[PDB]
Design a protein around this ligand. Structure first.
Ligand SMILES: *Cc1c(COP(=O)(O)O)cnc(C)c1O
Ligand SMILES: *Cc1c(COP(=O)(O)O)cnc(C)c1O
Ligand SMILES: [Ca+2]
Ligand SMILES: [Ca+2]
Ligand SMILES: [Ca+2]
Ligand SMILES: [Ca+2]
Ligand SMILES: [Ca+2]
Ligand SMILES: [Cl-]
Ligand SMILES: [Cl-]
Lengths: 423, 422
């Protein structure tokens, strides 16, 4: 029987310091109605709470830890940079080294700009798209999260009416359509087409759980934007370096005008980036008039973590991710079928998510049919069995290059027990 | 004679990779017309370029490096955290430790929320003010920079109005001159029912160092209180730098919300917004105001911030003020000697020199600085081994490790640079 005494006491302290006792809303474990787990350390695919409990980690800091916790190569590079200075406020050669790697790895990126988060990357790409086209409106999808820039906080799904504090002056310039609903994007262009600066889309939706694009969706977005003079922006903050070697755009063969990156690009440190066609990126200050800056953007510590992370990813890493994701899908499918549990498993490249509904999960509306009581009961038992999954039905399982076949087998064995207690 | 050949070759490569070859506009050294210096390493108050040139550093990454480069305690704390994992996406005890220190250090902060930058801190504080008051308009000052959130990119001054910001956003931002309380009163007379907040730097730092005039900050507190608007202090630069208890503690003016950054991270990407508990309670997950961040409160950044802040004592500020007084005297002595127009501003520990005899009390007066004198002065300071901010519209940053010998060498270098202007 797992004990959470130390985590309970630390959360009593936290609640008197931060809103809801956390620095990010999902960390309060409210979706599963459990006491939040306080983490002490990690190594590879293993994470340890302050009560000394060990877990197989499928959260990986919500995506960044593609090589798990404390990867030796990343750690040594961080220690070497720290001794020489973590930030200078002037150019460094390490910034060149990561920018070159990102340009080579991401198809659409010819010129890149580093920032400190995915929120900074998407807000900057929207400003660039509006400035480049001379247009006001942006189109996004219902149930999709792109960070907390005001224009993007409209119908942002699970966890996010729409956030107060966002004026009508902002809301009026954001159009929202159901993810995977190509015809409704086409209809929006019939009304707003020459005032739409951009369409922003996740190549695989990740905030409504894992929802892959339907056939013809992404290709359709590329067609409608280019025919109407709008930019196509791929928000690859979660998908980038994770769904495939050359990202979602590489995986599906659809090339956007601009791409936003985060999460894995930092390998455990706060890093984001936006990049794309050279003629568009040239409009960003100091080369152009569209202002964006950051004090810690491109700092050597974050560039080293990001470089050491990305250089260790090869095409073979993704073949292994796909093999493990297929094994997890089969094991979860077998456990749900054995116990008569409604379930739908989505898989796109390395990404995988299980929804507690029999409905085919193709959009936010279908995702919302998930049985959240079953999710919370399944989650509670997975914690008891030593598995740390994302505490939300509206998230996929994150894999690392360090998950072993023994980890996968133990996860499936835990899921069988967890499914057996639902009904 | 100093050589910059390796920095020149590295910038040639950078220009094919990033817009303007940089990750932040100031780094391109365009205000001074020079080849950007590529930095390799630093130690204490010393910074080294890739050509092997040593500099006395007054940039300190534009504020964060209050203990200079590679402070041993900060480095040892980063190394120890890295070995155990830099980010978990679940709560940690180190986040409690830093939040507790910040709540104690910053007067107005009862509840705090960590973010990854000053830009994230200010955009969130504006959204919270609008949500809390149910109002749309924000008031900021001309020539002041609060980060790149769309609402704040109006009259943002030196380096910055940006295209890509729709009129839908612009119509909700009111801008008036810094240190002009009467225009603020007028703005409240005309639009007061719709003003969610006034955002202000306790000491302006983006138009060079411009301290507040008598009655300005108090007047902002009074006008906001009386009209139901919040008072937000942008202490991203002033926080933990101008005084032990920040700008608000130094001037004795308590805002509703405070934004932090820069020194709070000690050289790592960290920001924060905090304030009255009943306001902060409206932020998610406690309330309906949405704000989140994946790397927010990560242990590596919490450890860097904690070790940085715990090492600052009231005595650190007595020493900063002593050194800033020495710099002001020596710089003033050099300008008078060479007949150079000058105005030196000092607020707490902060210091800036303007190449104008006009009293610099706002952006319009700061704009009277002779930029050709600034660039000529700057080029000679680099030749003498001093790394200053490459802009007239920035003050000099001191660290706890700048020695008296560093200060004296800086003054002697300024004497030579002033001698070549006229
Ligand atoms: C997490 C995420 C973001 C925001 O990134 P942060 O670093 O948390 O600000 C943006 N877009 C997507 C698709 C994400 O998953
Ligand atoms: C630098 C600065 C900011 C922005 O902080 P970043 O971390 O660069 O986003 C905000 N306000 C003030 C006063 C600043 O000096
Ligand atoms: Ca490319
Ligand atoms: Ca082209
Ligand atoms: Ca900057
Ligand atoms: Ca306080
Ligand atoms: Ca009170
Ligand atoms: Cl939907
Ligand atoms: Cl002015």
């Amino acid at each position: 029987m797992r004990k959470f005494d130390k985590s309970i006491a630390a959360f009593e302290e936290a609640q008197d310091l931060m809103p809801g006792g956390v620095n990010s809303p999902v960390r309060a474990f409210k979706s599963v109605g459990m006491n939040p787990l306080f983490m002490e350390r990690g190594k590879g695919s293993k994470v340890y709470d302050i009560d000394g409990n060990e877990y197989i980690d499928y959260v990986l800091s919500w995506g960044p830890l593609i090589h798990g916790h404390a990867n030796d190569r990343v750690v040594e590079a961080l220690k070497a940079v720290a001794e020489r200075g973590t930030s200078f406020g002037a150019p460094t050669e390490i910034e060149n080294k990561l920018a070159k790697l990102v340009i080579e790895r991401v198809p659409s990126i010819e010129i890149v700009r580093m920032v400190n988060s995915g929120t900074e990357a998407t807000m900057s790409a929207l400003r660039l798209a509006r400035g480049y086209t001379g247009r006001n409106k942006i189109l996004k999808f219902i149930g999709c999260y792109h960070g907390h820039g005001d224009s993007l906080l409209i119908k942002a799904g699970s966890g996010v009416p729409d956030s107060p504090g966002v004026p009508e002056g902002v809301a009026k310039n954001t159009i929202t359509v159901a993810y995977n609903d190509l015809e409704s994007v086409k209809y929006a262009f019939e009304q707003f087409g020459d005032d739409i600066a951009c369409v922003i889309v996740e190549p695989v939706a990740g905030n409504m759980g894992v929802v892959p694009p339907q056939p013809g969706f992404l290709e359709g977005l590329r067609e409608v934007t280019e025919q109407n003079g709008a930019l196509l922006i791929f928000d690859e903050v979660m998908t980038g370096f994770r769904v495939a070697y050359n990202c979602g755009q590489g995986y599906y063969g659809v090339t956007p005008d601009l791409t936003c990156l985060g999460k894995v690009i930092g390998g455990g440190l706060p890093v984001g980036a936006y990049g794309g066609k050279a003629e568009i990126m040239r409009q960003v200050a100091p080369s152009g008039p569209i202002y964006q800056a950051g004090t810690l953007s491109g700092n050597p510590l974050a560039m080293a973590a990001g470089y050491e992370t990305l250089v260790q990813l090869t095409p073979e890493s993704y073949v292994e991710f796909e093999r493990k994701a297929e094994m997890l899908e089969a094991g979860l499918r077998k456990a749900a079928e054995k116990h008569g549990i409604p379930h739908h498993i989505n898989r796109a490249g390395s990404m995988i998510g299980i929804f507690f509904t029999d409905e085919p999960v193709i959009n936010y509306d279908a995702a919302k049919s998930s049985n959240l009581q079953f999710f919370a009961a399944y989650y509670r038992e997975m914690v008891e069995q030593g598995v740390f999954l994302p505490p939300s039905q509206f998230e996929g399982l994150f894999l690392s290059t360090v998950h072993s076949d023994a980890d996968i087998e133990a996860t499936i064995a835990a899921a069988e027990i967890a499914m057996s207690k639902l009904k």
